[PDB]
UniProtKB/Swiss-Prot annotation, chains A, B, C:
Zn(2+) binds at residues 73, 123, 128, 135. Cytoplasmic capping enzyme that catalyzes two virus-specific reactions: methyltransferase and guanylyltransferase. mRNA-capping is necessary since all viral RNAs are synthesized in the cytoplasm, and host capping enzymes are restricted to the nucleus. The enzymatic reaction involves a covalent link between 7-methyl-GMP and nsP1, whereas eukaryotic capping enzymes form a covalent complex only with GMP. Residues 289-430 are annotated as: Membrane-binding and oligomerization. Residues 27-253 form the Alphavirus-like MT domain. It is a lipid-anchor. The active site is at residue 31. It comes from the Viruses. Palmitoylated by host palmitoyltransferases ZDHHC2 and ZDHHC19. Palmitoylation is increased by the interacton with host STING1. It comes from Chikungunya virus (strain S27-African prototype). A lipid is attached at residue 399 (S-palmitoyl cysteine). The record marks 31 as: Involved in the phosphoramide link with 7-methyl-GMP. This is mRNA-capping enzyme nsP1. Homododecamer. The enzyme forms a membrane-associated dodecameric ring with a central channel for the exchange of between the viral replication factories and the host cytoplasm. Interacts with non-structural protein 3. Interacts with RNA-directed RNA polymerase nsP4. Interacts with protease nsP2. Interacts with itself. Interacts with host STING1; this interaction results in inhibition of cGAS-STING signaling and increased levels of palmitoylation and protein stabilization of nsP1. Interacts with host TMEM45B; this interaction leads to viral replication inhibition. The lineage of its organism: Viruses, Riboviria, Orthornavirae, Kitrinoviricota, Alsuviricetes.
Length: 446, 446, 446
């Protein structure tokens, strides 16, 4: 019954992990936080499906699925520079444990590898060297882990016409990219991300700048005058770097109901099953034939606070403004309810937040100044609404229909509220190994 | 299981060593701090590789590898005045322990030395007298320790075409030389460094000046009017002096992915595995054939604070300004979060820092005045950003495209943030013993 | 294992001796401080070299080496008025212990003396009557103790061509004479020194003046108008007087690497191995053939504070100014960090220092007024730098290249900093007994 995590016992992340999985009993026994979430997510999926089922693994590392008693079929294309290391590590643990266990199948996995090694285009029960689109093995359940570089409707179609009914997806929350922020943080998982255009800023999580005296004139022949989010984004998980795309990240922010219309029509649902401080598990059920009705709305439930505000910084010497997002723990948000009734300065908000934080800290200190600035702008915009009050049921657009728009500098989603976004829901258009590496793999299994 | 370090038990460096190696259990049993980091770094590498592997040692001292049960092949060119002492010390411990151990190979190492002594250009299993480029022995794993005077892409190529797949590098953090500072400190390892041009300053860690009355006129015929970093730099580790080069230090600040393009193409990765207050361990994997894509970005994760500011000093009598860098412990940085919300004078910052330090001191007292001055300049530049706020999404470069650059006097990287630097990622161009010493070595082994 | 010193147990010098020799266990059992440092320095050297080695002693007193089990060859020229007393004391202890010990060679030393007594120009295993240059015995290890009146490169050459590879030097720190001070103190060893020109001052450690009423006119025909250090200097160790030379003292302040170029070329290193409040042990390794590269820099690491300031005094009735140096304990320096943030008067600095000193005193009270005056001048010159701040990377030498030099009245080297000096590193030019005493020596051994 009990489940054990490989983290400490005095940390604050233990309680969050407990309350994210309330049907387990997690016990204690810069990547441990992300590991344990992934450990409990795989355990949940197994408990959720009947055994003796064929399980696909899209873009996997087979060394993690080797010691499990389930019909795993790992898919390992050569897409990144870290992939041959994943393959080579598998070939070692297979040889290094080729006779020490007589319960789980270990000799069959050895034969599959050396068959694919000999014949590099053969589909085998527990291995292949294809993508998620070109693989031809039939199954019923698919699993994704940290897969951010594929189009979700196109990938999900190609698993459907091969008999998959149930899919999961583990990874970072996609909500900050639907609000279109320029940079942000996932502070509990040691992660910062930023747009390419602001990598030379000064006071965000992921940046680097220089010392300078400054000129009163810097002529240029090229004039931008426009600073908006672009497609390419950089992630830093600890000290590991990952480039990603906005379009492919947003495509995994799926609505409640959507239809896939190809040569075989399907009707699909998407629900969020786990949620812990910026890391989520999604579940997608699929079924043949198109029926029901779609609205095109996606909903996010907020167990902690979500913030997004305007900041001023210097980027390569030039002063500019853009938006930053972050997550705030629920206990901190509850204890600021009284203070935000009136207008408070950013300096006084900062001192109050530091006092509330000394309870070891609840939140990281490098995000405190931008959180204190968002809270005071939110309290000021609430007062202005109350002092400029309109008539019930009446928009006053007045002689020609031209109305005035107000300025909004903070978006604050309190705990127990919900975001709702209008997205697309009808989908119809669906657009390595070599001898030196081959020889090295074959040599170990010999 | 447990690992023991040769340092005290009441020092503050024990905790830092513990939290830098969280998968060990370090126990207590001006160079002890640097020793223990190097002891645990070698222990980690051995645990990371399967035994019965051939291990190279670039620019080594064989007396340290003598008592280890691994296939070490030491490489010892005669490049510095301290090298013949390293050779002579080996020849003593070999004779001095030629019959007292019957477990580790000791007689084979004796034969290799006297073979090279007789024939000074023979490659032997456990010794040679070549550089890292001209050696011709084949292996699979290479190790570097305190190697600062070689070009990294050129050295790493020549280990590749001889079958090396895995390399490590231990040494000082290269981040201060990518920010291009003029001087700096590594206070936990008793080290200061400085540019040649500022050796006659007054108030930095490594300098020396004179008493003088001062003239109102000192005519010169040569006019410099330009003070910028130059290639040659001096290091002082305790009281030992080392000259180094900026270009060769910066070349070990490698990106996540890079390609080596010679007569045998390779694709390479670089990750940072350990990090403790300015001393790091890097790991480089390599593989044949070129594949994947490169961005050219290098990332540093900051577990403690990193500072860099402008200071004013007198150099040989003349008042000037330049930049200095240092490291600040994380506990000190966290406790200044509240104070830096407002504008504070350098004098008041200094008094607060002294109070926080008396907890034996957390940080060395000679760096406190320059840290207190950086903190107050940072707090002032944050206020100016907040009071000169722009419009969202708009650069205001105005009739001809000429914008104003602001002045930046402090760079402050708080704990849990990351630096990101654009470096080069495609590499294609890859450019002693004598009789009196010979006789002395041969005499001992006789 | 344990080592015992002949000093008390409640003194503050015991802790300093402990932390200067951290690999020993010193235990308690106006010259005791200097004795014990010399006792532990000889013990270290023996532990550092393999036994059955021939050890030279340059300018020695053989009565100290008589009871030791090592191949000592004492060298005793008749250079000073205290030398025949050293010889006569040896001749007594030899006779006085000619039959009471049957372990260490005592009869062989008796024969060597009476052979040299009979034949005054014979080289013998354990005695000779030559200088360090004219002696012709071959050996491998040399030792110097309190040798201040020889040229170091010339002396070290003549030990090289006779097969010496390893040399040591014990004595006073040479750093104050590289800064060119006019007078100074070594307060923990009961020593003061001064230049000949200031022996008639009033308020320094070593001086003497008169009572006078003073004239408003004292005509002279000779005009000096220049007061600068000259070669001859006087030392007072307790109440014993020693005259020395600046040039010969400075020649033992050797760089990290230097070359000796004679009829037999050598390459040499110099490291500082022990350091305790002004007394040091140096180690010099030497090797044949010239190789490597030299920079010409010498480095001093400061474990305590080092001060040097301008003082005003009366010398033979006339008011003048000159520079004085001293050493300050590290605990005192740490506790003044807060105070020196602002500007403090000399009177208020003095009262604070007296309060901190009553912890028996940490430092001698006669040096307190000049230390308090240096600290307040240093704090004032730091404020002026901060209020006259320049532009980064720019010397402003302005129409003709003539810049203004500032006044410097204090040099303060804090604990954990390093001095660095440019010295010469290439060396190529290398420029008694009578019957009444003879009869007296011979009579005892008869
Ligand atoms: Zn497949
Ligand atoms: Zn070799
Ligand atoms: Zn002699």
């Amino acid at each position: 019954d009990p489940v054990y995590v490989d983290i400490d016992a005095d940390s604050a992340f233990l309680k969050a992990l407990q309350r994210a999985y309330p049907m387990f009993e997690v016990e204690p026994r810069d990547h441990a936080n992300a590991r344990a979430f992934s450990h409990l997510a795989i355990k949940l999926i197994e408990q959720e499906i009947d055994p003796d089922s064929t399980i696909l693994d899209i873009g996997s590392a087979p060394a993690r699925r080797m010691m499990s008693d389930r019909k795993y079929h790992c898919v390992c294309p050569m897409r990144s520079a870290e992939d041959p290391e994943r393959l080579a590590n598998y070939a070692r643990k297979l040889a290094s444990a080729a006779g020490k266990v007589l319960d789980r199948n270990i000799s069959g996995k050895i034969g599959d590898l050396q068959a694919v090694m000999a014949v590099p285009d053969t589909e085998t029960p527990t291995f292949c060297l294809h993508t998620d689109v070109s693989c031809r093995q039939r199954a019923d359940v698919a699993i994704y882990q940290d897969v951010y570089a594929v189009h979700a409707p196109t990938s999900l179609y190609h698993q459907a016409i091969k008999g998959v009914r149930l899919a999961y997806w583990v990874g970072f929350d996609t909500t900050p990219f639907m609000y279109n922020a320029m940079a942000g943080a996932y502070p509990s998982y040691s992660t910062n991300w930023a747009d390419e255009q602001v990598l030379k800023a000064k006071n965000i999580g992921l940046c680097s700048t220089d010392l300078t005296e400054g000129r009163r004139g810097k002529l240029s022949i090229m004039r931008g005058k426009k600073l908006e989010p672009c497609d390419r984004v950089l992630f830093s998980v600890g000290s590991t770097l990952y480039p990603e795309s906005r379009k492919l990240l947003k495509s995994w922010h799926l609505p409640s109901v959507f239809h896939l219309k190809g040569k075989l029509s399907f009707t699909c649902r998407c629900d969020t099953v786990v949620s812990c401080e910026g890391y989520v598990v999604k579940r997608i059920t699929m079924s043949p034939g198109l029926y029901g009705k779609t609205t095109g709305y996606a909903v996010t439930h907020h167990a902690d606070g979500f913030l997004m505000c305007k900041t001023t910084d210097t980027v390569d010497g030039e002063r500019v403004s853009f938006s930053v997002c972050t997550y705030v723990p629920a206990t901190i948000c509850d204890q600021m309810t009284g203070i935000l009734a009136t207008e408070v300065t950013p300096e006084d908000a900062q001192k109050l937040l530091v006092g509330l934080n000394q309870r070891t800290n609840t939140m990281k200190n490098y995000m405190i100044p931008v959180v204190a600035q968002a809270f005071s702008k939110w309290a000021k915009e609430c007062r202005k609404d109350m002092e400029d009050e309109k008539l019930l049921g009446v928009r006053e657009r007045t002689c020609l229909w031209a109305f005035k728009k107000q300025k909004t500098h903070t978006v604050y989603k309190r705990p127990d509220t919900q975001s709702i976004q209008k997205v697309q829901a009808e989908f119809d258009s669906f657009v390595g190994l070599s001898i030196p590496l081959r020889t090295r793999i074959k040599w170990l299994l010999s």
